[PDB]
Write a protein that holds these residues in place. Structure first.
Motif, short mmCIF file in Angstrom:
data_model
loop_
_atom_site.label_atom_id
_atom_site.label_comp_id
_atom_site.label_asym_id
_atom_site.label_seq_id
_atom_site.Cartn_x
_atom_site.Cartn_y
_atom_site.Cartn_z
N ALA A 88 4.47 -3.37 8.31
CA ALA A 88 5.70 -4.13 8.44
C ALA A 88 6.88 -3.22 8.15
O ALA A 88 6.71 -2.01 7.97
N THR A 89 8.08 -3.79 8.11
CA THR A 89 9.29 -3.01 7.90
C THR A 89 9.99 -3.45 6.62
O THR A 89 10.18 -4.65 6.39
N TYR A 90 10.37 -2.48 5.81
CA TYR A 90 11.13 -2.68 4.58
C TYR A 90 12.52 -2.08 4.74
O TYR A 90 12.86 -1.49 5.77
N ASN A 91 13.32 -2.21 3.68
CA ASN A 91 14.73 -1.86 3.71
C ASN A 91 14.91 -0.36 3.93
O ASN A 91 13.95 0.40 4.08
N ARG A 92 16.18 0.07 3.93
CA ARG A 92 16.50 1.48 4.14
C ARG A 92 15.85 2.40 3.12
O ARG A 92 15.63 3.57 3.43
N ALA A 93 15.52 1.91 1.93
CA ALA A 93 15.06 2.78 0.85
C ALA A 93 13.74 2.29 0.27
O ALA A 93 13.47 2.51 -0.92
N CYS A 94 12.90 1.66 1.09
CA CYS A 94 11.65 1.04 0.62
C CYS A 94 11.91 0.14 -0.59
O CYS A 94 11.10 0.07 -1.51
N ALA A 95 13.06 -0.53 -0.58
CA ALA A 95 13.50 -1.26 -1.76
C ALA A 95 12.56 -2.42 -2.05
O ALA A 95 12.21 -3.19 -1.15
N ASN A 96 12.15 -2.53 -3.31
CA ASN A 96 11.45 -3.71 -3.81
C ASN A 96 10.17 -4.00 -3.02
O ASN A 96 9.82 -5.15 -2.78
N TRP A 116 7.99 -9.83 0.86
CA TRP A 116 7.43 -10.32 2.11
C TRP A 116 8.47 -10.13 3.20
O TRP A 116 9.45 -10.88 3.26
N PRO A 117 8.32 -9.15 4.08
CA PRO A 117 9.41 -8.80 5.00
C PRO A 117 9.39 -9.61 6.28
O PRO A 117 8.52 -10.46 6.49
N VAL A 153 0.84 -1.19 0.00
CA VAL A 153 0.00 0.00 0.00
C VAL A 153 0.88 1.24 0.00
O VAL A 153 0.83 2.05 -0.93
N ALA A 154 1.68 1.40 1.05
CA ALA A 154 2.51 2.58 1.18
C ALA A 154 3.80 2.19 1.89
O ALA A 154 3.89 1.13 2.51
N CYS A 155 4.80 3.06 1.78
CA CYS A 155 6.08 2.82 2.42
C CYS A 155 6.79 4.16 2.54
O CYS A 155 7.18 4.74 1.52
N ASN A 193 15.75 7.83 5.07
CA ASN A 193 16.99 8.22 4.40
C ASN A 193 16.69 9.02 3.13
O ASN A 193 17.60 9.59 2.52
N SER A 194 15.42 9.10 2.75
CA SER A 194 15.00 9.96 1.65
C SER A 194 13.81 10.84 1.99
O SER A 194 13.77 11.99 1.56
N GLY A 195 12.85 10.32 2.75
CA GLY A 195 11.72 11.11 3.21
C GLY A 195 10.48 11.08 2.34
O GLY A 195 9.44 11.61 2.76
N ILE A 196 10.54 10.48 1.16
CA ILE A 196 9.37 10.43 0.28
C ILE A 196 8.37 9.42 0.83
O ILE A 196 8.71 8.51 1.59
N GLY A 197 7.10 9.60 0.45
CA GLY A 197 6.01 8.81 0.97
C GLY A 197 5.35 7.89 -0.04
O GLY A 197 4.12 7.86 -0.13
N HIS A 198 6.16 7.17 -0.82
CA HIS A 198 5.66 6.37 -1.94
C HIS A 198 4.42 5.57 -1.58
O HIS A 198 4.30 5.06 -0.46
#
Lengths: 49, 118
Positions: B94-102, B107-108, B48-50, B54-59
Motif C-alpha cells: 500500500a501507500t503511506y505518507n511522504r515520510a513513512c509517517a505512523n 490503515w492507508p 512490514v516495511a516502508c 524524500n529520505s531514502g531509508i528502508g525502515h
C-alpha cells in the motif's frame, strides 16, 4: 479643397526590420510523467493550442 | 487510478527467501511512499516495511525484511529472508505518507489486493 492638413493615425499596419529576443512555446504533452532534459522547458511557457 | 498491482507470491519452504514486488502508476507516485502489510487470520493488521520517499531509508519492523527500489522504475521489491512458520498471511503493498509517517499500524488508502504467502 486646396487646404490640406496633417492627421495622426495610431495603430497602423506599418512595420520595419528590427532585432530582439524571443521566448518559448513548447507543447505541454502532459509533462507530469517527465524525466527532465537539457532543454529546460519547465521554464518555457505553454504554446498556443 | 493509483492502484497497486503485486506479484511474486507462492509457497515457501521454511528457511528460504522471497522476492515480492509491486508496481503502481497514476501520475501521482512522487508524493507517496510504498510499504507492505502482514494481514493474517486471527490477528490484526501490522506493517512490514516502508521505503521512505524524500529520505531514502528502508525502515522495517523486523531485520529480515528489506524494501528496495531501482532508478526511476515504478517498481518496489520486498526481499524476505530466512522465513519461519509464522509468516503465513496476505501481503498487500500500500501507500503511506511522504515520510513513512505512523506506519506499521496506520490503515492507508490506495491499497492493493494482496498476495497470499504460505
Amino acid at each position: 479643397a486646396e487646404n490640406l492638413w496633417v492627421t495622426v493615425y495610431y495603430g497602423v499596419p506599418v512595420w520595419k526590420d528590427a532585432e530582439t529576443t524571443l521566448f518559448c512555446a513548447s507543447d505541454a504533452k502532459a509533462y507530469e510523467t517527465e524525466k527532465h532534459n537539457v532543454w529546460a522547458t519547465h521554464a518555457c511557457v505553454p504554446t498556443d493550442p | 487510478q493509483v492502484q497497486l498491482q503485486e506479484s511474486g507470491g507462492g509457497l515457501v519452504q521454511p528457511g528460504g527467501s522471497l522476492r515480492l514486488s509491486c508496481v503502481a502508476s497514476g501520475f501521482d507516485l512522487e508524493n507517496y511512499s510504498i510499504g507492505w502489510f502482514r494481514q493474517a487470520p486471527g490477528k490484526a493488521r501490522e506493517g512490514v516495511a516502508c521505503l521512505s520517499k524524500n529520505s531514502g531509508i528502508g525502515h522495517s519492523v523486523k531485520g529480515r525484511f528489506t524494501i528496495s527500489r531501482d532508478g526511476d522504475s515504478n517498481t518496489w521489491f520486498l526481499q524476505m529472508g530466512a522465513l519461519e512458520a509464522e509468516d503465513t498471511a496476505v501481503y498487500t503493498c500500500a501507500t503511506y505518507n511522504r515520510a513513512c509517517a505512523n506506519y506499521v499500524t496506520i490503515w492507508p488508502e490506495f491499497r492493493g489486493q494482496g498476495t497470499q504467502v504460505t
